[PDB]
Design a protein around this ligand. Structure first.
Ligand SMILES: Nc1nc2[nH]cnc2c(=O)[nH]1
Ligand SMILES: Nc1nc2[nH]cnc2c(=O)[nH]1
Ligand SMILES: Nc1nc2[nH]cnc2c(=O)[nH]1
Ligand SMILES: [Mg+2]
Lengths: 249, 241, 250
């Protein structure tokens, strides 16, 4: 594991000397804004399971995952997490995880960006299962404060986004109204199929975390023109969220 | 996957030219007209017996025996027979199950029309790469149970309805676990149904589900003697499809 | 499976003729130090094991102790976590005392306390029985209506009067979020830990009586080194007495 990380790191190092401070995990508007972009295809990167883009956003050096991994694709949880460990050793200090989510909270609207304040793991998989390298992180990571209080406060002082709890589920089929009523009872505001594994990895290796959700739809039980409109709304709202997060870090 | 389906389909086609409209999944068979039986042990890529024939003049494909994740099967393996049914030509699936009644109004021996499902198995037969020719990457599960099929069934039978929660098993639940499931809104608990329903929705089949209550669930306080009620439910479902 | 059991059993037999009545499953003190005529067998030497077994007597009663246990977060198959319990059955035990470390969800529980677990919720979504079943070992579909032996628990409680709670088993290894813990509280859990469920399912399967004790190590998420040392000592001595009582009243 540590050998795989080193191998991938060396590969990257030979293509960019950037010392990025922030990893950004995305599923145009924002990527197109990156300054002096260096692109590295996932297909060329040792031990990867898409493209990494390195460069600067508001003068700050960043590493962007243009494309991410999901347990519904068949990936082992550790594979999903590996790019995050790679980021740590390339030198990042924080991770912005974005996701697409169904709104369980009826006050949320499709197209909105929600600051995720906490997570629930309903995937019942964990990238840490198996023997642990204490050089990478502890056996039993504290998940008492997943979202960095200061980072979120500085972001919120600028953007004043809605906040919500995110529940991660395996997918790939969507949820039933019965399932969604369960999640509502259990306190979730948003449901998606990503985020949890990479957030667990990030906390493990000691990175700071913020998470944004883009509401793609109201969850089950709760026009193409409308998907067009909401897709446009989210793109520009997420660009501002992401830029703010980079700038205040 | 599509190759395994085609191989199984050719096998079946060489034994029955029936174009069945409905797949019936059973753990009534004696009533089937002109029955053609095919052992699961002979069918390419199967994990029991298929019975083809007619019920109230309508052609059907029956799974006399089904698969459960508690047996050790991969979810995709549990789902395969359903994809095979699709390509043999069925349009609907009637899934039966045995269930424990969490709703204390239900009594052992009753047939309940299942109105929705909760997946508490945390397994999905779709995990892994998806063939878009079979069905979409992200199936809609907003209306699993076909509203019209269920309405026509209910107009005849007026069954109780309930929410079915699928669990792995094979050990039964503790009273603490059953109180969880009650809080979460489940009326019935069983160890089947969910994987084959997910597969059906994926490949675009209509679905109805019936549960036979075999017992009150843990903490609250037979499929053979219920065979008559289930026979009527099944026959109604076929007839109104 | 039955062949693996017999192989391990023969290995043990050749080192101890004890006919132990009770298996005690511990995480790793004064309790082990108290065992009489202790015979120690390393897990590394035991056929088909995934720590040390210690055989001997506690208040004159012969016992088999697992000094060290297994967790699904380590990467073990559920059936592997369960195997020592089957082995215990065939060595002759009739009862199991499962200990664990747990986070207190119930705000009336304090770190360092021992709680008598009255029932379990499996939120690991793994089961050691998945796959084909040997009916000589136990039934295909074990009843879990009364996991904790009513009489054993009653005789323990008559002596100790411990708090009781519902234990939820989860995979880990990362700890829970405050959101996750509010889920568990709503679902009726008093304690959360990462062990117990697989071995208890196994035990019920093969027909052993079961009692479970939790040692509160901390309040769960969202609910001092000196205080760690204070509660650690408190727990040790409290668990010794719980364990000794359980053996004595069996
Ligand atoms: N699980 C789930 N994931 C999503 N990703 C985007 N929308 C949704 C949804 O409604 N449910
Ligand atoms: N899980 C579960 N499955 C069942 N199948 C039939 N009865 C029951 C029950 O009580 N619980
Ligand atoms: N899952 C879980 N396990 C534990 N083991 C000891 N303390 C804890 C806790 O707070 N949560
Ligand atoms: Mg060995």
């Amino acid at each position: 594991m540590m050998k795989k990380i080193e191998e991938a790191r060396t590969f990257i190092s030979e293509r960019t000397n950037l010392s990025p401070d922030i990893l950004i995990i995305l599923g145009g508007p924002f990527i197109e804004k990156v300054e002096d972009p260096v692109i590295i295809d996932y297909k060329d990167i040792p031990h990867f399971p898409g493209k990494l883009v390195f460069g600067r956003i508001s003068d700050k050096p960043v590493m962007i995952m243009a494309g991410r991994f999901h347990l519904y694709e068949g990936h082992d949880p550790a594979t999903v997490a590996f790019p995050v460990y790679l980021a740590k050793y390339v030198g990042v200090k924080g991770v912005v995880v974005t996701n697409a989510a169904g709104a369980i909270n009826p006050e949320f609207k499709p197209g909105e960006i929600i600051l995720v304040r906490d997570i629930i793991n309903f995937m019942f998989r964990n990238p840490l299962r198996g023997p642990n390298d204490e050089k990478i992180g502890p056996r039993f990571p504290d998940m008492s404060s997943v979202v960095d209080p200061e980072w979120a406060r500085k972001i919120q002082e600028r953007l004043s986004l809605k906040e919500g709890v995110y529940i991660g589920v395996l997918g790939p089929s969507y949820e039933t109204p019965a399932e969604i009523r369960v999640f509502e009872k259990l306190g979730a505001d948003l449901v998606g199929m990503s985020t949890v594994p990479e957030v667990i990895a990030a906390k493990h290796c000691g990175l700071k975390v913020v998470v944004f959700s883009c509401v793609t739809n109201m969850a089950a039980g709760i026009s193409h023109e409308e998907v067009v409109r909401t897709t446009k709304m989210a793109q520009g709202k997420i660009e501002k969220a992401l830029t703010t997060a980079v700038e205040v870090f």
